[PDB]
Design an enzyme around this catalytic site. Structure first.
Site, PDB file in Angstrom:
ATOM      1  N   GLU B  26      26.635 -66.093-101.987  1.00 21.57           N
ATOM      2  CA  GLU B  26      26.452 -66.215-103.541  1.00 21.57           C
ATOM      3  C   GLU B  26      27.923 -65.929-104.327  1.00 21.57           C
ATOM      4  O   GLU B  26      27.889 -66.764-105.161  1.00 21.57           O
ATOM      5  CB  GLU B  26      25.490 -64.840-103.983  1.00 21.57           C
ATOM      6  CG  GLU B  26      25.293 -65.138-105.615  1.00 21.57           C
ATOM      7  CD  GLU B  26      24.471 -64.092-105.977  1.00 21.57           C
ATOM      8  OE1 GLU B  26      23.571 -63.334-105.078  1.00 21.57           O
ATOM      9  OE2 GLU B  26      24.274 -63.912-107.262  1.00 21.57           O
ATOM     10  N   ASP B 106      22.243 -61.813-103.465  1.00 22.99           N
ATOM     11  CA  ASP B 106      21.465 -60.655-103.762  1.00 22.99           C
ATOM     12  C   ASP B 106      20.043 -60.747-103.815  1.00 22.99           C
ATOM     13  O   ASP B 106      19.530 -61.499-104.257  1.00 22.99           O
ATOM     14  CB  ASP B 106      22.186 -60.150-105.215  1.00 22.99           C
ATOM     15  CG  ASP B 106      23.879 -59.993-104.970  1.00 22.99           C
ATOM     16  OD1 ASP B 106      24.349 -59.897-105.874  1.00 22.99           O
ATOM     17  OD2 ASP B 106      24.425 -60.455-103.931  1.00 22.99           O
ATOM     18  N   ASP B 108      18.356 -59.135-106.194  1.00 21.76           N
ATOM     19  CA  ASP B 108      18.133 -58.824-107.449  1.00 21.76           C
ATOM     20  C   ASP B 108      17.488 -60.192-108.236  1.00 21.76           C
ATOM     21  O   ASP B 108      17.360 -61.280-107.756  1.00 21.76           O
ATOM     22  CB  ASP B 108      19.206 -58.312-108.264  1.00 21.76           C
ATOM     23  CG  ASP B 108      18.941 -57.722-109.455  1.00 21.76           C
ATOM     24  OD1 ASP B 108      17.605 -57.383-109.697  1.00 21.76           O
ATOM     25  OD2 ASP B 108      19.811 -56.927-110.012  1.00 21.76           O
ATOM     26  N   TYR B 367      34.856 -46.261-135.168  1.00 23.71           N
ATOM     27  CA  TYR B 367      35.049 -45.584-136.391  1.00 23.71           C
ATOM     28  C   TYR B 367      33.645 -45.539-137.293  1.00 23.71           C
ATOM     29  O   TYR B 367      33.454 -44.740-138.152  1.00 23.71           O
ATOM     30  CB  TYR B 367      35.949 -46.399-137.534  1.00 23.71           C
ATOM     31  CG  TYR B 367      37.285 -46.804-137.125  1.00 23.71           C
ATOM     32  CD1 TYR B 367      38.177 -45.856-136.905  1.00 23.71           C
ATOM     33  CD2 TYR B 367      37.523 -48.124-136.890  1.00 23.71           C
ATOM     34  CE1 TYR B 367      39.319 -46.319-136.204  1.00 23.71           C
ATOM     35  CE2 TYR B 367      38.631 -48.716-136.377  1.00 23.71           C
ATOM     36  CZ  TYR B 367      39.546 -47.883-136.019  1.00 23.71           C
ATOM     37  OH  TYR B 367      40.878 -48.442-135.563  1.00 23.71           O
TER      38      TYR B 367
END
Lengths: 759, 759
Positions: B26, B106, B108, B367
């Site tokens: 892959e 994979d 998944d 922030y």
């Protein structure tokens, strides 16, 4: 005649133009705050409005190229600024469309200092008189607000040192909530209204003095040796007198802003790329190490990289993005020949990469788990002296330490390189045996070269050798001239006409190496195909040659004495160039000519830390002995002499105050923290009282008293040993240092016998 | 004749070509695993090596355009595949350079199913016979490994259902460690060696059947109504018989792979963009809400967005990146006219954005602080029925729930839109008053329209009106034809020749609106300048016209009856187009023609949850009453009848077993969890015993017995009330639903009186 993100003031450019001011917002978030404040309406009748006030954005804005800046062109256009004319007189300044320009930027490092510094530099370069006459102004919003329960009016501080002085004399700061506003977006709706109610009070003017002219040339418009001295000293915060003088007239000298705000931004960028020589890691890597110690302290359980990255961001105040965080976490656990870390902080579970792609073939953080190397970390970075290190505080919250002081110098023991094209830094790891010999000789008084090494410190004799590490490298390290070279290994099959490369240079990826050979037209004319059959952590590259090309090679590469013809035809050697650039622990940049200097500079820091560890331990033991002796003495002077029927805080206090029980501070003597010896002495003695009477009835038993008495003897024996350690001949804690060196070596050997798995 | 990231097998293309196999990795991480396995050397003499085996990468690879794919061109070149010829005979298949191709991807969703599905589709489109004759193969690595202490050989499962069946009959799964391997990079070094020791056992072949031909046309090569039915049903996992049949011959039918692996990938992409109609949030937003409840449960303290984002990633298994996570967190706390959330989950502290930029002017997450809206969340999402919801499990760890069932339908109450250009979804919030009337009528038996509404459910009469929400909108909502339109408000000053826009359409940003007007050449010929003096959360735009342009406008826009000439000259109206696309709770896509259907579909789910909440509470109360009665009965039958001198687990057990004390399961009755009624019944009765004897001596006192007896009476009174609630006329828990509706309404009113600050 249009400018993006610019709102025209109603009176701008008219008769009342001099009464108008232009607000130069840093970005969209700053613009929203200004829009809210400027449109409070009848709620703030005396506050500024869109009358005599406009907005403009400074987004982007990051000399011929200076004039091509579209953002700065808009500012010139809206202000009516004209080049080739000097605004030395009032009548010439009256032609501007606005009376003054006010910069509304965040009070963080990527705020004033970079965006505001460029704005000041831009005005200084073209119109110095505008800064002299006060045309350029700054909006100084409050930085720290302290909120106390029961009061709706907070205490506002515009500088970090102002809050520190106030908090020092504020006794117990338990009922006060402290909030940090490093950006304009951090202000709440009610805080914005309060700021704009006193808008004129927070407008500050920039003044130009003689010292600022030289500083502008150094920080801006110069990337040469001139900047070197400025960045070699660190940032000096403004003194109390300077801060009070600024607030007295609301005038900020340009030199002070450059020396503090601009320099800190410059040093911050370097600190993100250049590690500290005490431990050889950047601030980003410190949070990962500090977060890793904290995350895996309770239980050393495998965690996903993205899961562990979230822990670092949540606890160690990491806000630079998970893309850089996950990459740095993966690099901290990679273990292969040529990897950056010879001694990875974490244990790599899964496919963390390989030497062929230089660690770029690491698996996705979702499927890749990480685990702390407890054996190596607990020895190289002791936990008992981690309290002694200075700590970075992010918005008043404790973060990763300023620097680590490991048992051995990690800035020398690892391979380091900065991918960024600026402030070149390259480190080649020295072998463990050479480093151990130097450190042991410096510490062990019985070492034959202990006296010679100490003599060599002051004269840089360098009696002991330091050589590049050959671990995980089946090649050759030859020193020619003043540079080291790493040579690869090759095999030649005459009958098969195939050259097999069994080893590459020290830090040369396999895939990159093949591309370099393949892209060389002169070398490729002798090669028909290259096949990479190399295994993991080993090199096996088959180079197929032309039928009559092996002979022709030797007459084209001349068989250099230093480099073999095959080692020249195939780039199997490289130079170990070292760029020893590091950031000082106090701040600044330090240049090292040799690897000895880094080791020599690291020794005093580790030497004094051992003395600091024993001195604080000595102070803690004395306090614990006093407390335990008083508790034991209380049992012998129990209700038989003075009862506890009084059951009141004041009443029980004075009855034994005549007896002589000290009012020692509990929860601090039992559990010390990041407290210095001087700080510990004042708080422990002059603290609360409630350490007696709070014990359960079983502690007054004879059997319970025996363990307390035995505990005192154990601490007394430890206290005597600490005094002996403090009086050692070389320096205090010399034997302790030697013991920890052996523990580190055993962990390294154990981690090297395995593949840094330990299990 | 070169291919990137391709390693030639030694025997490839030769006499032994049919014995060679091509491993289609892959990506780079997959290539590293294959390189390690293929080069085990003498450690795995019987395993595969670079002899008769090669590697190739499938990186990227994401019909004329299909033939232009460079990655697929390399696969054809290395395999020797030829177009225009059908490999219907063995002699023609013998010309290929490799015997077969094996895909190493994979396990998944972004693995097999997308990368492998395309590879199967590519081969099926051009060479169907290759799939028929077994040329295309798959490497089926283990998915779940179970490790037990004292054993070095784990138990490997290739499917989720295989582990579920094994774990069901494995009694107490406390001594077993379960690890999930959703990607090839998740395998450890020793696990890779084990996999390649039995390499031939994990090689699976793809078979082509009649049903697969239609499926290939649907999933691939089609983006039309054909795909609609397939994605409207959800994913059906493979049965035990199908799984056993696959492993018996190591042959995987292509239809089964498409129906499970490929469909799940397709649904996952939609689920990331299309919310569920039960609560109107996607899976990413669920983790934020579930993480927000967990993070702020202990203490509702302000946290930074990046700090809170790290908590979600660490605890809720969020791995899609902080850039999307921080943006989604900010959107969950924005509160302004036209914001996506009318009822934000969080409380926005700082500048979270404004209507002018459509929330794009939010401050930096560093922030910007966030805080959970405890009052609204604890009422809209009750915590007592959160245990009842199904939960998503990520690698065996509990994650955010599959869906939430709020007291009121949030998929109707909020504005929703998908920025992605696919699966259009637009929701316009209905007003609270109309929604409350419908829900109250359905639940309250005393409502005058309670019987009428229930009749209208089965016939879609829709007696009660549902109208768009006009909150935070000072405009007009007019229904013309079958669509609603929102109109802005303008003021015309004849003497000043200025048109002032005092209100924009419902979800039109100010900055975008001005650009649309400014970019219209026909409209701009009557406008000299546009000035945006709008405040925060209010619109005030000054449009300056030409001296004689106001008159000319009316003859160019014709004064449409539906749209005024000024409302036509300035685009002050828009159509409230609704694309009611949602994902079903069990899986799939559901289409709703009207907002009534979404409310009608949501009602049964909330109705049964209240019955489920009371039924489980009834079961828990009965268990608690039995345990407390036994404890109280034990005090009355204390050492006076049977002493505890035995002090052994077995010995104390049988002495009272004749008396009749049940062996109830403690730590489960006292603290229920995500356990169903059926699961609770078996575990509580047939559990451990140690709930008596473990109590301290003071609990046997008369005073201590009184509170236990009083506690039983309190629980008995609650138990009787629960039975009454279960027998209500409309449905069980009807009055409980009505009470919670009022609590939600009070929280909404309190949050609307303030600016969603609550303090």
């Amino acid at each position: 005649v249009d400018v993006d993100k610019y709102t025209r003031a109603r009176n701008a450019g008219g008769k009342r133009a001099q009464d108008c001011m232009l607000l130069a917002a840093e970005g969209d978030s700053a613009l929203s705050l200004l829009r809210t404040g400027l449109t409070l309406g009848k709620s703030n009748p005396s506050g500024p409005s869109f009358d005599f006030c406009g907005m403009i954005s400074l987004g982007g804005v990051i000399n011929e190229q200076l004039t091509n800046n579209k953002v700065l062109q808009g500012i010139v256009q809206v202000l009516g600024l004209d080049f080739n004319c000097h605004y030395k007189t009032q009548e010439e300044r009256a032609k501007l469309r606005y009376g003054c320009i006010v910069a509304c930027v965040d009070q963080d490092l990527d705020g004033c200092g970079k965006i505001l510094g460029l704005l000041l530099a831009y005005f200084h370069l073209f119109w110095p008189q505008l800064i002299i006459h006060g045309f350029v102004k700054r909006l100084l919003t409050p930085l720290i607000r302290v909120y106390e329960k029961g009061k709706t009016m907070p205490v506002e501080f515009y500088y970090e040192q102002e809050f520190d002085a106030w908090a020092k004399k504020q006794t117990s700061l338990v009922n006060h909530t402290v909030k940090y506003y490093k950006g304009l977006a951090a202000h709440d709706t009610h805080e914005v209204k309060s700021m704009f109610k006193h808008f004129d009070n927070m407008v500050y003017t920039f003044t130009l003095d003689d010292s600022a002219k030289e500083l502008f040339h150094i920080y801006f418009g110069g990337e040469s040796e001139l900047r070197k001295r400025e960045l070699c000293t660190g940032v000096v915060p403004l003194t109390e007198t300077q801060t009070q003088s600024i607030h007295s007239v609301r005038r900020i000298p340009c030199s002070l802003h450059l020396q503090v705000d601009t320099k800190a931004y410059k040093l911050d960028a370097i600190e993100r790329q250049i590690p500290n020589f005490l431990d050889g890691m950047t601030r980003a890597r410190r949070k990962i190490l500090a977060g890793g110690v904290k995350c895996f302290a309770s239980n050393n359980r495998e965690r996903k990289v993205f899961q562990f990255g979230g822990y670092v961001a949540d606890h160690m105040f990491y806000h630079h993005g998970d893309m850089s965080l996950n990459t740095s976490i993966i690099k901290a656990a990679q273990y292969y020949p040529g990897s950056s870390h010879l001694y990875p902080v974490f244990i790599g579970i899964g496919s963390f990469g390989s030497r062929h792609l230089g660690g770029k073939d690491a698996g996705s953080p979702r499927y890749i788990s990480v685990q702390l190397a407890s054996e190596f970390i607990k020895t190289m970075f002791p936990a008992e002296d981690s309290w002694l290190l200075p700590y970075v505080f992010e918005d008043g919250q404790r973060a990763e330490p300023e620097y680590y002081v490991p048992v051995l110098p990690l800035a020398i023991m690892e391979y380091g390189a900065n991918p960024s094209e600026g402030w070149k830094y390259t480190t080649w790891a020295r072998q463990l045996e050479d480093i151990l010999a130097l450190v042991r000789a410096y510490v062990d008084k019985d070492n034959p070269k202990h006296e010679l090494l100490h003599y060599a410190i002051k004269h840089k004799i360098t009696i002991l050798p330091l050589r590049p590490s050959n671990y995980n490298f089946k090649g050759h390290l030859k020193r020619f001239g003043q540079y080291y070279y790493s040579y690869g290994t090759y095999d030649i099959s005459e009958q098969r006409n195939i050259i097999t490369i069994t080893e590459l240079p020290l830090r040369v990826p396999t895939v990159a190496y093949i591309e370099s050979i393949k892209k060389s037209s002169n070398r490729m004319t002798f090669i028909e195909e290259i096949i990479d059959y190399s295994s993991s952590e080993t090199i096996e590259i088959l180079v197929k040659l032309k039928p009559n090309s092996l002979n022709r090679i030797v007459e084209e590469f001349k068989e250099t004495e230093e480099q073999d013809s095959i080692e020249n035809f195939l780039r199997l050697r490289n130079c170990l160039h070292s760029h020893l650039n590091f950031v000082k622990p106090k701040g600044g940049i330090i240049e090292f000519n040799s690897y000895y200097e880094i080791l020599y500079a690291w020794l005093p820091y580790r030497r004094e830390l051992y003395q600091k560890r024993l001195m604080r331990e000595h102070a803690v033991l004395k306090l614990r002995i006093i407390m335990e002796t008083a508790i034991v003495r209380y049992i012998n002077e129990s209700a038989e002499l003075n009862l506890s029927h009084y059951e009141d805080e004041k009443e029980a206090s004075r009855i034994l105050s005549e007896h002589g029980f000290p009012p020692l501070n509990h929860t601090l003597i039992i559990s010390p923290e990041f407290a210095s010896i001087e700080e510990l002495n004042q708080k422990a003695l002059q603290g609360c009282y409630t350490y007696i009477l709070s014990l359960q009835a079983r502690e007054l038993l004879i059997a319970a008293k025996t363990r307390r008495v035995e505990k005192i003897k154990k601490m007394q024996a430890r206290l005597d040993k600490v005094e002996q350690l403090l009086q050692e001949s070389p320096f205090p804690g010399a034997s302790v240092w030697l013991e920890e060196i052996d523990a580190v070596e055993k962990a390294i050997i154990k981690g090297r016998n395995t593949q840094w798995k330990f299990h």
